[PDB]
Amino acid sequence: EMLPNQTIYINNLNEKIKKEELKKSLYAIFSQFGQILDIVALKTLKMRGQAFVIFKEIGSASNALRTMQGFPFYDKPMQIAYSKSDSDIV
RNA sequence: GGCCGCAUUGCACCUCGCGGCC
């Protein structure tokens, strides 16, 4: 099982949504959990449907993951895990 | 810049699947 990390990894995201909008919408629902350093969403073949939300505190990430797990975002239940590895900005 | 089709459920941190229309 994935250990806690201050970055959460989200997938099963609706790929039809433009990346800039996607990120603003994500910030709309995750900022309640604590300070966000950055949100990474790419639309490459490999990385579309996915995003990284990088919290300042690990406890924010844990709370965000547990609370928002499965929340239907642009119609699709978000799938949320901790990221495998630390995000670069540190 | 705007539409749309095919394929993709994928762990990233300098681009970066393919095709059609305006």
Residue numbers in the entry: 2 to 91
Pull text from the paper.
We used a 22-residue, blunt-ended dU1SLII construct to determine the crystal structure of a dSNF1–96-dU1SLII complex at 2.0 Å resolution. dU1SLII contains a 10-nucleotide (nt) loop (A7-C16) closed by a C6:G17 Watson-Crick base pair (to simplify comparisons between the various RNAs, we numbered them identically according to the provided scheme). The center of the loop arches across the dSNF1–96 β-sheet, L3 protrudes through the RNA loop, while L1, L6, and α3 border the outside of the loop. In contrast in the Drosophila complex, the corresponding dSNFRRM1 residues (Leu43, Thr45, Lys44, and Lys47, respectively) do not allow the formation of a similarly extensive water network. While Thr45, Lys44, and Lys47 engage in water-mediated contacts to the phosphate oxygens of C16 and G17, a more expanded network is prevented by Leu43, which replaces Ser46 of hU1ARRM1 in dSNFRRM1. As a consequence, C14 can adopt two alternative conformations. In one conformation, it is bulged out and does not contact dSNFRRM1 (two of the three crystallographically independent complexes in the crystal); in the other, its base is flipped towards dSNFRRM1, where it rests on a hydrophobic surface formed by Val41 (β2) and Leu43 (L3) and where it engages in hydrogen bonds to the side chain of Lys24 (α1) and the backbone carbonyl group of Ile40 (β2; one of the crystallographically independent complexes). Lys47 (L3) contacts the phosphate on the 5′ side of A12 in the Drosophila complex, while the equivalent hU1ARRM1 Lys50 does not. While Asn12 (Asn15 in hU1ARRM1) hydrogen bonds to N7 of G10 in both organisms, it is stabilized by Gln80 (Arg83 in hU1ARRM1) only in Drosophila. Conversely, Ser84 in dSNFRRM1 engages in a hydrogen bond to the 6-amino group of A12, while the equivalent Ala88 of hU1ARRM1 cannot.
The U1A/U2B″/SNF family of RBPs is found in the U1 and/or U2 small nuclear ribonucleoprotein (snRNP) components of the spliceosome. Jawed vertebrates use U1A to bind stem-loop II of U1 snRNA (U1SLII) and U2B″ in conjunction with the leucine-rich repeat (LRR) protein U2A′ to bind SLIV of U2 snRNA (U2SLIV). Both U1A and U2B″ employ an N-terminal RNA recognition motif (RRM) to specifically recognize their RNA targets. Here, we report crystal structures of four states of dSNFRRM1 at 2 Å resolution or better: the free dSNFRRM1 (residues 1–96; dSNF1–96), dSNF1–96–dU1SLII, dU2A′–dSNF1–96, and dU2A′–dSNF1–96–dU2SLIV. Altogether with the characterization of dSNFRRM1 dynamics alone and in complexes by NMR spectroscopy and targeted mutagenesis combined with binding studies, we delineated how the intrinsic dSNFRRM1 RNA-binding capacity and specificity are fine-tuned by networks of intra-molecular interactions that modulate dSNFRRM1 dynamics, and how the auxiliary dU2A′ protein can capitalize on intrinsic dSNFRRM1 flexibility to gear dSNFRRM1 binding specifically to dU2SLIV.
